[PDB]
Design a protein around this ligand. Structure first.
Ligand code: GDP
Lengths: 703, 82, 85, 62, 205
RNA sequence: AAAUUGAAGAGUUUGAUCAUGGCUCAGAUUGAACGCUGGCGGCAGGCCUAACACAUGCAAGUCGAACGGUAACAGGAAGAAGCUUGCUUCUUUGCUGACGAGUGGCGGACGGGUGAGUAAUGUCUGGGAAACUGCCUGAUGGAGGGGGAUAACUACUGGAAACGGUAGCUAAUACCGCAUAACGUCGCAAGACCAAAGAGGGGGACCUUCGGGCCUCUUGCCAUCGGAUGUGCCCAGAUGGGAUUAGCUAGUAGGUGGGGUAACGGCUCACCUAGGCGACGAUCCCUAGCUGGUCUGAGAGGAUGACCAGCCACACUGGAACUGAGACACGGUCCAGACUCCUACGGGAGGCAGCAGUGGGGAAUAUUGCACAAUGGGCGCAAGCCUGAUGCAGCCAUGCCGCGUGUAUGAAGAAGGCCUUCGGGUUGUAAAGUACUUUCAGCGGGGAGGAAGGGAGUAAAGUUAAUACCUUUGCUCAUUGACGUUACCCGCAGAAGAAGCACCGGCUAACUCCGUGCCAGCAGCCGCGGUAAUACGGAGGGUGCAAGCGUUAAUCGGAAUUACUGGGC
């Protein structure tokens, strides 16, 4: 049956700040397990994790692509394990890729730089890991570089993110004296070989230049591991050290229970430390079943409605966590089999999307190459082909219903612009690619606009939309030249009512019959009637026909929606009507409506409404380093501001800003605070401002 | 090798084969040098729900043809010993 | 190739070498006889004919040429030989 | 070639796609093609209640 | 597919009595059956040649409940048959299982008779036929399939079944609820109110 | 006995008529498209354009009863791990089942897709001689005897990946020569020459090198003449338009000779003749697969090649041949050109017009589905394997047919709409009400047929020399269905869960009001609308058709409007 027992699976995630070396370490791992020759780099694009040709050229990993191998811990290089790495990107623009990946792994090796320690994006993915208690260890990449330290990085992780890091390694040599790693469990120092030949280890003796500090952090690791359970404390208290195996199991339980984070060092570029990091992957990260059993739920929520676990006998129950765009077969859906066994062509009931699906093929991955395989079992990541109804986050299972998996969460985009192809004939050929992209990615929302005929889209940064626009030009060969979204001005009178009439009749020569009504233009204050239109009747002279009074309000409705100022729907407006003329015959409401048209268009313009501009309620949460700076930028924009409250990890600041100005505000916001600010933009009120941009529509049509 | 097989004329979920003498090259419904008798496997009361043409079948199998399994069984039947 | 036609291509090439060899022997002897004919030496011609006749008959029976081809050959050569007088 | 635009009130700019069906106009000179109302953003005539299939109007619910 | 809607509208537009409603009480006491259903029936339309042709064909169609489709086929066959095409058309129209059911009773009108024939509550010579267009052959018992009795609507219909001519082709037992089909009903065995030659010329136009 | 019993007209030039005369209309039909709407079921249909480029999964294998043998699985033998000499498994051992890879034999040239090419190298009709023909069949014989490799392999070396070498062997139905063969080939004869393979099943006699031999039987091989199937070739006739296309052709036409093809042939070569085609249309040009038939027509006729079937040509484009019975070969070869993919940079792989599916074009046409259970087909002795042929399924009202969306009752003619002569008319028995039923779809239960066959056990003769092996015929036993929750039957509650579209001026079947005023608009022709619109739009009401309705496109008819039947100057 299955090629390996479950305990040989290690579903690990690689995620960190940008450029911290995720892809380099992943390629080194692939080489050191032997599915890749020619270790390769990224700045020359030849790496195999990078295929989309954007990360070939631009040398930035943009999307996660799972990959598997056979590296081993028991008599390493033998007794193979199954390490499923997922090379996730670390960009704040692509944090959605981290989100869904971090929600689908059972562990993940976090990467830290020895130059800067943690970085704002790492503090972000730390929240995205605590969000799911994903067990995790640290890999201090880039020790080989100038000014790189190890203990400082350890202190950084200890102090800033709030965790407890324990050294599983100590480094021999800082910048270019880095020649290998000394350990605190094996207590022997490894000196890797020369360039691209770091496959070997050459176990060697610990040099005396570091023996004392090695001993210090060794005993510290010893006591911190014994902290796991009582029977490890007293044995140590008796004047006896624990041994490798029980220290390893105890720390491993700490990682299972998400109490600790282990740090390993290395330099994925000088080909040092990669194997010793794989050592930690094996020795401490939970296997699929070592993790607590998945919380499955029936169509109703309980404590244990569907107790599922990784088994060949358990029902097929998995989480479709990633879609991908494939031109050939339409889509390509990743899925991580939490429990059970499923085969090619077999059935599956989309428990969430309320349908049955089928697996045209099931392909496991080599970062792009879709390996054709018969079946996939528990703990084994795979990509399903052909299933139509499913999207991200959905749950795929047998008819026995572990229907509810816990998550349906994804962030809200912050940047928005509009797009337009070579000509307005290809608009459906553009919206089609947009639909594919919006079904592939949750945060990226294609936003058909109703006020104008433009197609605006929303992403989480200048870079994310930039890959999307090129990926659109590249994969879907329709180039779209971009611009800003149009503004959403509006109309309403200040306070004053003005008496006005409009007169014209029809039948002087025997024609059809007429209409005539007197109106007075009263507004309400912005936000008075929640229904944008409020009416009070006062007809007493020339009483319009009994089936025509409501149609008078419904005809001034047209004039409201018309908005004789610049075409804009007049809001909170009110009209009061007094006079008219009628007979007990069949008059025409349309003439009363045109009559009311002339009346509206004159009396409004002379009652002097206001031409408002969209003003948004803003909330921004940013650390206390650049509160003054971000507030300064906001005030330079149009700063209307709400208040100030100190959160645990920052400050609570809300404000009021024009939608005519907030367009590219996201990149500037993050650039003003190193990207440690959180914020959402939503509407509060419409309002006026002295601006000579107020005549664009008036120029296109109207007064 | 002039096989004598069944041709599967008729309709969906309603077979009505046709005894044909044809080259074993051509298709099932394909070219044949002659057809000899019909066969229907859901005929409740029709012409025996089966018929062969023993004179012409003898002509062919004597001059050097062969016989498929269904046509052979149908002749085993029409020869009323069983 | 993608199918078990590779074995067939290999067997066909082997048979190509071999049938080329046998055909070449046949035509070598036929050119022998045709030289003997264009020369004028009748006894030599009939000798060459008897030298080639068993070869070509064996070959036709091997199927490299067809019985009609072997018979046509022997007929051509016998006729022109008895004309050589 | 040319094309009529039936019904009351259209929304066809300089680059909007439309469908063309046969049938001349018998009074407009040289126009021999009715624009199929209600297909490919050449949306149907608004506020119709009789003969909606031709002229492309969604059946009102009521 | 069945004509849904008002019935006396049809009978009154066609003016003549077509028996759409149960022949229980009367027709002109319930509907003012002389004028069109429209508010403009007080006017006398002129009804030129094609008017009378369409009216005749629509009369026979509303009597028998068959629609223009399958009616064009009831012309196709019964023209394919040798002999008078109009008379063969009336023959196949009479042989329809619903028509024979109603004419032997079991249902006071063609609509009740079709509801019966379609509700799997009849048995042409032993076999449950749920096909309101089953063309019945001569020498066929109709065998109303007991447990299709004891509902009192078929009984009331069998009661009302008399005061009507016992048709010279039916020979309904009338009490064991069966009926032979001696021979195909003649054209002369019918009302002679309906000009079948009108329908023939209408369709051969 | 039946093989047909089958031919319609109108609007429209004029003040008005008649006639020629064209435009349009009612009809039938469609691989259809789109708008509106849309319940089910059965059966059929589904890339007409871009023969445009194609990701991926499959679309051709089989045979141990041909061979060497042992890659994997086991039946296995002897053991001293395991171990209670094993029921608690170590290996040598193809010894047997079975079989990776290899040799070999058969298939792959079938089945399937497309219509680019093709105006005649074709197709169809009817004949002909100058031939071939595996597997299939009738008949007649032979089935000595031996050797040389070579694969697999082994060793070594490349492939720093894929993908190949240098030597050493060893088998076969692989291959080669001698023996022999004639009504076979050549030859007038005289005369000469020609081939082959063995395997499997059983066992009484008797010799053995337990290998067997041997007498059997089942298969197989070679040769030769027939049968049949398929196939090659030839001829006469028909098989689109354009003469704004009048000449065209040197292997061109033929004679002779040589060669070649399986076969006859300027198929080819070499002479020699100067001929040959042509107004019955040569040549050139455009276009096109042909046909059985399909749509139409009363018939002649017109248009056409969707489905199913026969023929042909083609398989990225151009060219060539190799094996073969059969190819100049879709999933074979080789070369040139384009393209694509892999490359470790030294190279290498591929051909969806196969089924699915993508992208592009389009207005437009389906799942990356289920199984060999039937039929088949290849191989096999058979079980048995392959089968995107096939049988089924999924999508879509694409079409044809059937069915229901309730049935009866009901004058307070309810309300209310609309009209109005102001009394009422009509919606209208229509709904409401009342009773009856449950088709269909939804649940629940029950349940045909498509299933022939083949396995084991058995008997009768048949076989021999053996009643053994094996055909072959019965017999009993377990069984082989994808569809599939089949069709279908019966029960369950309720009338619920199911009607729309177009038209209403004449042609045409169906009329009034309000709203518009040559504006908005309608329209197939005639035309309507410039204040009383049955012609626009809405309302009411009606007429048609009804899971369709309408529009468009398209062929034909009506068109006696290319008139041969059937017209005119
Ligand atoms: N010095 C040093 N440079 C590194 C290391 N890892 C990655 N880099 C450099 O970082 C650049 C991009 O690395 P990349 O794989 O894109 O990091 P990622 O973006 O987190 O995957 C390259 O130029 C590498 O040379 C390291 O361990 N040491």
């Amino acid at each position: 049956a299955r090629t390996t027992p479950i305990a040989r699976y290690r579903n690990i995630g690689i995620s960190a700040h940008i450029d911290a070396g995720k892809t380099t370490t992943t390629e080194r791992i692939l080489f050191y397990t032997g599915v890749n020759h020619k270790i390769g780099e990224v700045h020359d694009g030849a790496a195999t994790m990078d295929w989309m040709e954007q990360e070939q050229e631009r040398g930035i990993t943009i999307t996660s692509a799972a990959t598997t191998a056979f590296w081993s811990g028991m008599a390493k290089q033998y007794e193979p394990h199954r390490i499923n790495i997922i090379d996730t990107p670390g960009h704040v623009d692509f944090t959605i890729e981290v989100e869904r990946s971090m929600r689908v792994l059972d562990g993940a090796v976090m990467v830290y730089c020895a130059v800067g320690g943690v970085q704002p994006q790492s503090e972000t993915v730390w929240r995205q890991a605590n969000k799911y208690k994903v067990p995790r260890i640290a890999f201090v990449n880039k020790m080989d570089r100038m000014g790189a330290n190890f203990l400082k990085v350890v202190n950084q992780i200890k102090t800033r993110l709030g965790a407890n890091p324990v050294p599983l390694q100590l480094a021999i040599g800082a910048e270019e004296h880095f020649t290998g790693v000394v350990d605190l469990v094996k207590m022997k120092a490894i000196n890797w070989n020369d360039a691209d030949q770091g496959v070997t280890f050459e176990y060697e003796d610990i040099p005396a230049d570091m023996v004392e500090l090695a001993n210090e952090w060794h005993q510290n690791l010893i006591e911190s591991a014994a902290e796991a359970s009582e029977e490890l404390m007293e044995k140590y208290l008796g004047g006896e050290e624990l041994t490798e195996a029980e220290i390893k199991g105890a720390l491993r339980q700490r990682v299972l229970n998400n109490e600790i984070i282990l740090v390993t060092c290395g330099s994925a570029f000088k080909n040092k430390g990669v194997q010793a990091m794989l050592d930690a992957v094996i020795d401490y990260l939970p296997s699929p079943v070592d993790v607590p059993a998945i919380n499955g739920i029936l169509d109703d929520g309980k404590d244990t409605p569907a107790e599922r676990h990784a088994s060949d006998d358990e029902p097929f129950s998995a989480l479709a966590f990633k879609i991908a765009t494939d031109p050939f077969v339409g889509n390509l859906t990743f899925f991580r089999v939490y429990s059970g066994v499923v085969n090619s062509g077999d059935t599956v009931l989309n428990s969430v999307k309320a349908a049955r699906e089928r697996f045209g093929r099931i392909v496991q991955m080599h970062a792009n190459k879709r390996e054709e395989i018969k079946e996939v079992r528990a703990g084994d990541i795979a990509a399903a082909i052909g299933l139509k109804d499913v999207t991200t986050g959905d749950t795929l299972c047998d008819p026995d219903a572990p229907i509810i998996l816990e998550r349906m969460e994804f962030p809200e985009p912050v940047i928005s612009i509009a797009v337009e192809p070579k000509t307005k004939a290809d608009q459906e050929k553009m919206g089609l690619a947009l639909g594919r992209l919006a079904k592939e990615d949750p945060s990226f929302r294609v936003w058909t606009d109703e006020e104008s005929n433009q197609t605006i889209i929303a992403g989480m940064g200048e870079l994310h939309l930039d890959i999307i626009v090129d990926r659109m030009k590249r994969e879907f060969n329709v180039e779209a030249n971009v611009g800003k979204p149009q503004v959403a001005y509006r109309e309403t009178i200040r306070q004053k009512v003005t008496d006005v009439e409009g007169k014209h009749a029809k039948q002087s020569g025997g024609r059809g019959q007429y209409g005539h009504v007197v109106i007075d233009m009263y507004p309400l204050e912005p936000g008075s009637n929640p229904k944008g239109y409020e009416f009070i009747n006062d007809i007493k002279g020339g009483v319009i026909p009994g089936e025509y009074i409501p149609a008078v309000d419904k005809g001034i409705q047209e004039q409201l929606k018309a908005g004789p100022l610049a075409g804009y729907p007049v809001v909170d407006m009110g009209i009061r009507l007094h006079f008219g003329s009628y007979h007990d015959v069949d008059s025409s409401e349309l003439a009363f409506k045109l009559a009311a048209s002339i009346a509206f268009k004159e009396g409004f313009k002379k009652a002097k409404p206001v031409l408002l501009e969209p003003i948004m309620k803003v909330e921004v949460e940013t650390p206390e380093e650049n509160t003054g700076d971000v507030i300064g930028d906001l005030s330079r924009r149009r700063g209307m501001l709400k208040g100030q409250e100190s959160e645990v990890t920052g400050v609570k600041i809300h404000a009021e800003v024009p939608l005519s100005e907030m367009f590219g505000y996201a990149t500037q916001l993050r650039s003003l605070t190193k990207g440690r600010a959180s914020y959402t933009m939503e509407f509060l009120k419409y309002d006026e401002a002295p601006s000579n941009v107020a005549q664009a529509v008036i120029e296109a049509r109207g007064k | 090798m002039v096989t004598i097989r069944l041709a599967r004329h008729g309709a969906k979920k309603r077979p009505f084969y046709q005894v044909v003498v044809a080259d074993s090259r051509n298709a099932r419904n394909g070219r044949f040098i002659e057809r000899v008798g019909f066969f229907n496997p859901i005929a409740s009361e029709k012409e025996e729900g089966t018929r062969l043409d023993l004179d012409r079948i003898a002509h062919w199998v004597g001059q050097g043809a062969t016989i498929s399994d269904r046509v052979a069984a149908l002749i085993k039947e029409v020869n009323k010993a069983a | 190739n993608i199918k078990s036609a590779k074995k067939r291509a290999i067997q066909s090439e082997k048979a190509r070498k071999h049938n080329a060899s046998r055909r070449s022997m046949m035509r070598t002897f036929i050119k022998k006889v045709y030289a003997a004919i264009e020369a004028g030496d009748k006894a030599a011609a009939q000798k060459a004919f008897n030298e080639m006749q068993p070869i070509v008959d064996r070959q036709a029976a091997k199927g490299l040429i067809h019985k009609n081809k072997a018979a046509r050959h022997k007929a051509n050569l016998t006729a022109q030989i008895n004309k050589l007088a | 070639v040319t094309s009529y635009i039936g019904g009351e009130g259209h929304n066809l700019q300089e680059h909007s796609v439309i469908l063309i069906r046969g049938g001349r106009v018998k009074d407009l000179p040289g126009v021999r093609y009715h624009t199929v109302r209600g297909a490919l953003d050449c949306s149907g005539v608004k506020d119709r209640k009789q003969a909606r299939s031709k002229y492309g109007v969604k059946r009102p619910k009521a | 597919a069945r004509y849904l809607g008002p019935k006396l509208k049809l009978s009154r537009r066609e003016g003549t009595d077509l028996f759409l409603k149960s022949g229980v009480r009367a027709i002109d006491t319930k509907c003012k059956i002389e004028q069109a259903p429209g508010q403009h029936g007080a006017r006398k339309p002129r009804l030129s040649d094609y008017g009378v042709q369409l009216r005749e064909k629509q009369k026979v169609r509303r009597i028998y409940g068959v629609l223009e489709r399958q009616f064009r086929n009831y012309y196709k066959e019964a023209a394919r048959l040798k002999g008078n095409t109009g008379e063969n058309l009336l023959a196949l129209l009479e042989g329809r299982l619903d028509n024979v059911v109603y004419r032997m009773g079991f249902g006071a009108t063609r609509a009740e008779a079709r509801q019966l024939v379609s509700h799997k509550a009849i048995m042409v010579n032993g076999r449950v036929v749920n096909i309101a267009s089953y063309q019945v052959s001569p020498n066929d018992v109709v065998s109303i399939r007991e447990k299709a009795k004891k509902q009192s609507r078929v009984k009331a219909a069998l009661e009302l079944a008399e005061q009507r001519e016992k048709p010279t082709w039916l020979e309904v037992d009338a009490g064991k609820m069966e009926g032979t089909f001696k021979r195909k009903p003649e054209r002369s065995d019918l009302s002679a109110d309906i000009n079948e030659h009108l329908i023939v010329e209408l369709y051969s136009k």
